[PDB]
Amino acid sequence: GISNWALDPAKMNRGIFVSRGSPNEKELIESAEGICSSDRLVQDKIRGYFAPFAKAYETVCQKQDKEFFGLRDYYSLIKMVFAKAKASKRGLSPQDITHAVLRNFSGKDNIQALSIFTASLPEARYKEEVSTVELIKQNIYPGPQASSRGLDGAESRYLLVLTRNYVALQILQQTFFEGQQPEIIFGSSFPQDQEYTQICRNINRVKICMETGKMVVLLNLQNLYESLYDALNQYYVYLGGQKYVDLGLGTHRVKCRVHTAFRLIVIEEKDVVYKQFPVPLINRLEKHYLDMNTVLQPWQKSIVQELQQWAHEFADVKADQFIARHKYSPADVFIGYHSDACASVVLQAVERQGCRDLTEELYRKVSEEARSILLDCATPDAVVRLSGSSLGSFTAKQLSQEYYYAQQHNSFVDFLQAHLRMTHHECRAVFTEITTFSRLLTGNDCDVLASELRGLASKPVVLSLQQYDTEYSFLKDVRSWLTNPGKRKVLVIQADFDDGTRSAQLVASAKYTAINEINKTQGTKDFVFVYFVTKLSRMGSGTSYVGFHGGLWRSVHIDDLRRSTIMASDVTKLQNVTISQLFKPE
């Protein structure tokens, strides 16, 4: 009977009971020497830092109140210091020490662990800033210098990314995830799926990704903790120079092969971590915090505030064309604005830049790209109302020229024919979500879209999201779309938020399922264009729509999906003439 919590002596009069309170400083420096005993020279170089780290860890664990940091944190600190001292062959820079302390002793808010660990260590003051983003980048992406030896004892633990309002995955998918996207395991929200079979299939996907060696981003763990705790422990059984860890289902424990480049990230709210996780879990996972203020530099926050002011004066129009009082909110004008959208927009603009050094030639085009992102999802009557707006009349002129000549907002077919001919460099799959007030495409409109994409696309499969109870039917149709021949495929998933169906929390599950099946099923010769068109109303649903999701989703508002054969496709032409000049003959 192994336990982490205490026991009552009525059960341990049967057999032998071994209890240990907490290791004192001599046992801590002995454990550190037992870790570092695998090499002699580096251990006799870095025995000077064992007793400082032990006293500093004891002051940390006595300073805090909840048992947030434990022995795995100190052990991983000693292992990381030992690995840097092995790979360095000169000693420890204070940069190496501050990276080890700040990768290990993070996550807790009311603890300044740098100041505690450099109180006792007054040489290791590092006057330069250390971003959390590069610590996450060197946790996820080690190079060939790391993990190149006999066995793997200098491997990192895993990631636990604590957040507010579920905003880790956007930042991880724009800034961090390079080359090959991970395989997102998530708590699927399709109806009439049983939880047990979904836990089984999620653990199968985790197991396959341990074998092939791609990353895992878990969005649930309170369903998977009983089945993955021995993997989170990172204690391995070696057969043939290959590592095997225990995985369980029900009462079935087996040793599954782990590839030498495997990473796992749990994403979880800060509150749920601080009040629902049992805390062997917090001690196993190398915490960091990344909300939106962590990743945004202060000038980018000033761009966020300036952009919110720009939106609130884009929307607030003062005119008396009709004698009515209806002050427009930027939620009304920009279909998706939810008072947290401009941070997402600025993060999308910076990640579209690729240069990233503040130079007043970059700052201006981040601001213009952010304005372009807002303009790319605005209704056209707002752009017509913009002549009497608080911005001006030349700003409204250039925004209308951008909205009608740079950005394609005519219909769905024109957005395709302008979107396919863009030479997407180093993007094998381009993902765009589209918001509309028209009717969704029927099956006769799909035939017209296929005949009008005769030489460009590859017969767009249109899927309706209400027609899917289980997840496997949706995966069957995505796989049947994927196994068709021809390149430049187009998938169209269709949700409607204004009906009696519940298909408004199905959107994230549909997107995650599609993204996982594309990342595991697509070849390297074919390109993929998945469009998620959602149907909204001007009756208050278009303003209650939570919008600008980042990650790998570009957000557009095409107003009508169907190319009109009646009116001209240019509102400026209708703005020049009047109604009598419309009937003027040749």
């Binding site: 049983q194 079979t197 089984c200 653990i203 197991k207 289902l249």
Partner: protein
Amino acid sequence: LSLATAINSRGVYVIEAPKDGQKISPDTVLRLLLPDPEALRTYSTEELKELLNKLMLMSGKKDHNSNTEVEKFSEVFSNMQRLVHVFIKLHCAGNMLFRTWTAKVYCCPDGGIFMNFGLELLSQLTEKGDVIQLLGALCRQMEDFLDNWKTVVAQKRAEHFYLNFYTAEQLVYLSSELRKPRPSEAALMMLSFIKGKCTVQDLVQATSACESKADRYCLREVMKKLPQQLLSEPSLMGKLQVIMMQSLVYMSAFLPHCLDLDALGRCLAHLATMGGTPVERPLPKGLQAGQPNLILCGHSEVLPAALAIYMQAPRQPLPTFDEVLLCTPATTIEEVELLLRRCLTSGSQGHKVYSLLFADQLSYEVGCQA
């Protein structure tokens, strides 16, 4: 693995509603049969769950046949277990149509569903084809039937007041017992709460004077129209839709040995009118008689205060399981809902005080639903 191919080759799922004395858990409803020599092997659902766990987590062969057999087995089993889920919901809601239901499901390629009732007027249903779409359509159909059955039983509980005295299984037991020539003593004593010192002559009078002979004419009309009405549908979903809507509108045409909810409600209201002197109770001086009366007492003075309330009319007889409900942890929602139906429905021939004692002791979900 080759066991899973043998399941996907000749395995037969069986929903049976087990005839033994044991309960109606999902562990004892579903079975799986394997034929071969000529022996057979029966698997309960716990061993199929342990084998699926061993097979979802076994080593990757990297072959298309292997993972398509595991996916086919897992999807047929999940849809079949979901059918078990909808079947147990229809059972515990109390139905007496899908009480003696049974279904074999053939996991052969183009194997099909073989469906059967415990009825004499119905025939052996069968349909071949793709198994997953048949289970999906069947489960969607049975979910729509559960919603329609809950709506019909809500509108029978709303128009018959005394049917609200009993839960679902109690109405099933009474409907089985009153059609018998000599009903059981447990049924003839549970009906003492409506009539009082009830006996077999009052009950045979009530079950003779309840239903007319025009119901015989309309059920025979259904019995002659139904053969050329089932054969207008090519598939199984149309035949089941016809059977289910006619079971909604004429229940005793299918079950010629039990009362339906109309005849039960009329029999109870007739038993109610043989024995008179109803109970008239006033509320105390300071309690309004048209709204809730929430009273906060303190834990030692809850059980005396209810006995204070019921002394506003002495010589009126003591309460029973109606008009007082003692709430406690592990109190189901149906007890509270039937008390609220007894307090807020019409035909009652008296004025009675309806009490919820220790109504704070309920759970959060039962409280929200109440």
